[PDB]
């Protein structure tokens, strides 16, 4: 059973920094695209930062250089270094992975439970 | 030679790992050697010097309604409106530089705007996020192109589930050809 | 995206180093994006399970006269005659395995036998020796195909001299487009 | 000026061994496809062994495992190790190179003067 677990979320003040981690378990083959999404209450889920299938990195317009997405291929982990946190960054941050589930390279998209990030003065 | 068919009005998903021969197989189809007219969307974007509009309608006559539908289905509405010149924004002349995702969406909009017999979409969602990809796959590849002959290069089980036929390749050779039900009876 | 033309009845030589983008350009042409029906010869041979003849005439009507001109021009006359079943020799079924050069010559024969608007020959001489290459280049690409629209992927100056137009690529972009005379000034 | 120079040719008895070398000079960009050809007296030039443009090796039917083509990329040299020499192997052995003469990968085919190989009992 493939499982994703986010950590590092919490309460921060404006201008604060946070580091979100996402651990995986039950990965038999490999993970291709990994990334970070978020949803504020009563808002639609949106991209934050992600590794595309191509190997490049794609950041959302609102990031404005503040956040960095990293990856550990050996551990099958994804990270989000957040800086210059704004009240607008308050959301449940979800981890995503396109996991290779076959020996022929077929994939399934998996999501974590989410971690709460609260930015308040 | 690979044993598969291209059925009229159906979605054929071409799956497999990197180096499996997926792009080569599309080239064999365009080159008329397989299987035994074409609207192509390359896995790396393609843009010509000209406007956003010029890149999508690509030499054919402008139809407001057809254009409007394609743009909506390829998630290009928001992007275009944010430009002061909008649709007339000039690309590829040292001026405006779009993102890999925007370029990928234009490339796909050009491919679906074209009135063709066969649509070859080589990994069109490789530079897109998982949410944008889902919106485009459902509204464009599945709904807007519902009775068009499509060959989509994808290894996502979520897409394979919606395909009429699946072709899995391994090191230049076919491993599987058939339905999602047939594929499931191997899990 | 690449500024070049494909002139009717002329030989366009596409030159460049490995990775320059030559195979992609051919795919852009077949995919109808470039320059802005098809007889294709891939850089690695292609063979289908069937006879030498079935592989060359490839589902089209058999023409006794064209077939024998194509076998002669593609230096296959000697190879076929040395097989006890000649043209009726069976390929791709675990039986007879041809050399890379024989497979290359059969791939080219299939490409020149076909009645097409555009002939795309991606490095057809890459698995052949310099003497055989010169014979096929002159008898086939130059003589037999003299008034066909050909795109030959080659970086040989000997070949470029005989082309009507040349396109030199560098890392997916055009460096030069023009005649051999125009190329001669530089370097 | 690109120049190819064969050496190692000579008189040998049937069953003898010989090693042909081919040195190059004036190579600015490199070489692709180096090879060995021969012409027997009153016969048309024919392939012996060559490295193809595709990096693979192609031997003539008559070699029957007796000869080996080797290459030194750092020195821009090609070699022909000959064993089990037959009277039929008597010919002037020529060296060939498809030389990269441009920064865009444009090539010119160059030939050596030839080295005499005589196999006689
Ligand atoms: N009949 C054939 N004989 C020999 N080789 C073949 C044949 N048919 C296909 N191939 C091979 O298929 C390969 C195609 O690789 P390709 O670049 O298409 O991989 P891909 O699956 O598209 O990977 P990516 O995920 O990078 O797009 C070629 O390298 C070619 O050698
Ligand atoms: N408009 C474009 N935008 C971005 N990349 C492009 C564009 N057009 C072509 N390319 C790039 O050109 C590359 C060409 O690779 P290709 O396999 O065709 O090489 P090649 O020249 O044929 O080498 P070889 O001689 O080994 O066959 C592709 O990787 C593709 O990304």
TrEMBL record, chains B, C:
<feature type="domain" description="ABC transporter">
    <location>
        <begin position="1"/>
        <end position="187"/>
    </location>
</feature>
<comment type="similarity">
    <text>Belongs to the ABC transporter superfamily. ABCC family. CFTR transporter (TC 3.A.1.202) subfamily.</text>
</comment>
<protein>
    <recommendedName>
        <fullName>Cystic fibrosis transmembrane conductance regulator</fullName>
    </recommendedName>
</protein>
<comment type="function">
    <text>Epithelial ion channel that plays an important role in the regulation of epithelial ion and water transport and fluid homeostasis. Mediates the transport of chloride ions across the cell membrane. Possesses an intrinsic ATPase activity and utilizes ATP to gate its channel; the passive flow of anions through the channel is gated by cycles of ATP binding and hydrolysis by the ATP-binding domains. The ion channel is also permeable to HCO(3)(-); selectivity depends on the extracellular chloride concentration.</text>
</comment>
């Amino acid at each position: 059973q493939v499982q994703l677990q986010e950590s590092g979320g919490g309460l921060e003040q404006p201008g604060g920094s946070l580091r979100l981690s996402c651990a995986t378990s039950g990965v038999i083959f490999g993970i291709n695209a990994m990334g970070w999404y978020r949803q504020a209450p009563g808002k639609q889920r949106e991209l934050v930062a992600t590794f595309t299938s191509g190997g490049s990195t794609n950041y959302a317009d609102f990031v404005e250089g503040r956040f960095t997405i990293s990856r550990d291929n050996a551990k099958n982990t994804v990270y989000l270094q957040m800086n210059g946190l704004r009240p607008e960054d308050t959301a449940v941050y979800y981890c995503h992975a396109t996991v290779v589930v076959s020996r022929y390279g077929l994939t399934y998209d998996y999501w974590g439970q989410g971690t709460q990030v609260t930015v308040s003065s | 030679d690979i044993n598969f068919k291209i059925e009229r009005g159906q979605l054929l998903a071409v799956a497999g790992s990197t180096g499996a021969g997926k792009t080569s197989l599309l080239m064999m189809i365009m080159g008329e050697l397989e299987p035994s007219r074409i609207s192509f969307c390359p896995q790396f974007s393609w843009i010509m010097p000209g406007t956003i509009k010029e890149n999508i309608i690509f030499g054919v006559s402008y139809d407001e309604y057809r254009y409007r539908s394609v743009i909506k289905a390829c998630q290009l509405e928001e992007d275009i409106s944010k430009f002061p010149e909008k649709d007339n924004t000039v690309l590829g002349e040292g001026g405006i530089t779009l993102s890999g995702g925007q370029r990928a969406r234009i490339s796909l909009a050009r491919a679906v705007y074209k009135d063709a017999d066969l649509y070859l979409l080589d990994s069109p969602f490789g530079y897109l996020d998982v949410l944008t990809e889902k919106e485009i796959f459902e509204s464009c590849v599945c709904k807007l192109m519902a009775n068009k002959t499509r060959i989509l290069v994808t290894s996502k089980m979520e897409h394979l589930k919606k395909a009429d036929k699946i072709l899995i390749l391994h090191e230049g050779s076919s491993y599987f050809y058939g339905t999602f039900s047939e594929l499931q009876n191997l899990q």
